[PDB]
Structure 1
Amino acid sequence: SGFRKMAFPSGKVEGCMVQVTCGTTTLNGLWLDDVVYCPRHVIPNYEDLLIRKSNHNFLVQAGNVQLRVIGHSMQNCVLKLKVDTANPKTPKYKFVRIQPGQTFSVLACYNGSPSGVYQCAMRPNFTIKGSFLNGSCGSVGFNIDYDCVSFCYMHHMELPTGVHAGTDLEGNFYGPFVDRQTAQAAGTDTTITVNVLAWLYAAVINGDRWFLNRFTTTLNDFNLVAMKYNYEPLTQDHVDILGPLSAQTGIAVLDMCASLKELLQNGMNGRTILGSALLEDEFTPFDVVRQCSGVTF
């Protein structure tokens, strides 16, 4: 029993974190095989800025060992520093781009040293509500699939509202952001509906049933209601993905949608669900199954 916001074990990623220094800027790099990946803002016309840099300008530090940079290239908003040494701790990995609503673990780092690990979701507005201080750029987001690390995020910036923006490991930003000091704002955010439904199923699995009702709803009526509360539309794909949880608890997805509809129109009334007074949207249906079944890595 119990339901916690749980991150993936960070060990396979910890063995990849390095410190990258260029001039006065120090941030984090991800060392995989013989390449160190980091935000290109460590060096704006980035082709013009990069052409002026030589390999020896980039100081890469893996623990108490200085790696030697033997090449450099830019791929979108990520700088790829070719080093002479392949990381012996390189795990089986992939670079994957995630969609809004998908969750991942963040290994927050400062000076190439991991400081903490937390779980978060790619918001529908493409920002992450992370926890990052100055020096955290280059910290990465990931998931683990069996023994394979899927790198999905690299931290680049903090927006004026305190939320965070970054890229995939191919340097493509999530969201309409640019890596430049300029007026940028996170768009109006919405609630990840499929994730709230997954969290309501997790609450049922843990004995919380007070919010259940005899009612059901159509997918169209639920979406008309959900749109009124700044909730993301629920698609038939989401309904299908919630299938296993529906089968395990005996509560049809549209039956749980009627519960969610009543929760949105009437509130919690002094009650909590899994120790929360708000509807939690940073657990995907897969996170719920994984935690309520004990999948290991």
Structure 2
Amino acid sequence: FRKMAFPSGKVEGCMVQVTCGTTTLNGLWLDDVVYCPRHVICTSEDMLNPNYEDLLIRKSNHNFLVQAGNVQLRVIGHSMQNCVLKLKVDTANPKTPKYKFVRIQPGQTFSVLACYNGSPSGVYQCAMRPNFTIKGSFLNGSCGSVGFNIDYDCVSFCYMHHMELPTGVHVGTDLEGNFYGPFVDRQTAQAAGTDTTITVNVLAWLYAAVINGDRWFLNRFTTTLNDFNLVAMKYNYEPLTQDHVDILGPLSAQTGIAVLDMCASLKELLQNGMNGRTILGSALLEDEFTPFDVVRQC
């Protein structure tokens, strides 16, 4: 068991560099459109109360320098969609994969291709936190890097990176430019809400531990769904819904362990800790593997 990302090649051939004035960041080149954060047009002095419509009307196509590897792309038009800028270019990307845009829910996971100056540096896995932030690894220059899944040769783009908050977590938009969570591309006092643990993912990971041969944390108890939730919330765990229970069904069938019986085991693990032991290499309960991820990998 490992945090497995998707193979990044299909996304690597879409990464470009976008420069506007003194600002350079990453863009996503699909067909004849380059997508990037609309704050590329801002000078940081603009960031307290930016009027993006007023800022954008003053720009010409040639104010945007887009470079794909060694070749310059010619911008022939531009438009704003929510908080994403769409730069129409003269050339369509011949490496455009089969793709779609998907807005994900808190708890969903995806791979991130971290990029600087249009060139990929690394790939890793992470999750939409319940507070709509992601715990990424991003440095100055990484704005415009994207997150994606690739189930069955279709790239589903779900995240574009915009900002790092004071607590060091990361926020961005879907590829239609709508922010995840209550955040805005503006220098305001916005702070992440208190984060909670993604309960349905912890349960999926415990099922993965059972598949790989550990049973030490099981017990003879069960629980009602409401009693579990009353307990779980006292540990800042997210409520478990009947939807989550249904989604865990396949893992329950494979292991012979009823979902509410695994909930009874999680209750005891939160009460007892791990007693010097580890589960799948970890001394903490892991919440960034979804039920789908466990089935994919195991």
Partner SS for 1:120: strand
Aligned counterparts of 1:214 and 1:245: Cα–Cα separation in 2: 19
Partner SS for 2:267: helix
Farther off after superposition, 161-170 or 211-220:
211-220
Partner SS for 2:150: strand
**What's the CA shift for 1:214?**
1.4
Q: What's the counterpart of residue 58 of structure 2? A: 52
Partner SS for 2:87: strand
Of residues 102, 108, 113, the one that matches 2:108 is 102
Partner SS for 1:263: helix
Aligned counterparts of 1:189 and 1:116: Cα–Cα separation in 2: 26
> Does 1:188 find its partner at 2:186?
no
Partner SS for 2:268: helix
In the TM superposition, what whole-angstrom CA distance separates every residue of 1:220-255 from its partner, at most 9, and x where no partner exists?
A: 110001111110100111011000100001111101
Aligned counterparts of 1:182 and 1:63: Cα–Cα separation in 2: 35
**What's the CA shift for 1:68?**
0.3
In the TM superposition, what whole-angstrom CA distance separates every residue of 1:15-57 from its partner, at most 9, and x where no partner exists?
A: 0000000000000000000000000000000000000110000
In the TM superposition, what whole-angstrom CA distance separates every residue of 1:88-124 from its partner, at most 9, and x where no partner exists?
A: 0000100000000000000000000000000000000
**What's the CA shift for 1:212?**
0.8
In structure 1, runs of 5+ residues without a counterpart are: 293-297
**What's the CA shift for 1:182?**
2.0
Aligned counterparts of 2:207 and 2:74: Cα–Cα separation in 1: 51
**What's the CA shift for 1:181?**
1.7
**What's the CA shift for 1:211?**
0.4
**What's the CA shift for 1:266?**
1.2
**What's the CA shift for 1:145?**
2.0
Query: TM-score when scaled to structure 1?
Result: 0.97
Partner SS for 1:280: coil
Give the number of aligned pairs: 290
**What's the CA shift for 1:7?**
0.5
Q: What's the counterpart of residue 152 of structure 2? A: 146
Aligned counterparts of 1:31 and 1:141: Cα–Cα separation in 2: 14
In the TM superposition, what whole-angstrom CA distance separates every residue of 1:60-87 from its partner, at most 9, and x where no partner exists?
A: 0000000000000000000000000000
Q: Percent identity?
A: 100
Aligned counterparts of 1:223 and 1:200: Cα–Cα separation in 2: 17
Aligned counterparts of 1:19 and 1:84: Cα–Cα separation in 2: 16
Q: CA RMSD in A?
A: 0.5
Q: What's the counterpart of residue 295 of structure 1? A: none
**What's the CA shift for 1:162?**
0.3
Aligned counterparts of 1:104 and 1:147: Cα–Cα separation in 2: 15
Query: TM-score when scaled to structure 2?
Result: 0.97
Q: What's the counterpart of residue 33 of structure 2? A: 35
Aligned counterparts of 2:137 and 2:168: Cα–Cα separation in 1: 9
In the TM superposition, what whole-angstrom CA distance separates every residue of 1:178-237 from its partner, at most 9, and x where no partner exists?
A: 101221211100000000000000011111111011111110110001111110100111
Aligned counterparts of 1:198 and 1:8: Cα–Cα separation in 2: 19
Q: What's the counterpart of residue 139 of structure 2? A: 133
Partner SS for 1:220: helix
Q: What's the counterpart of residue 44 of structure 2? A: none
In the TM superposition, what whole-angstrom CA distance separates every residue of 1:119-157 from its partner, at most 9, and x where no partner exists?
A: 000000000000000000000000012011000000000
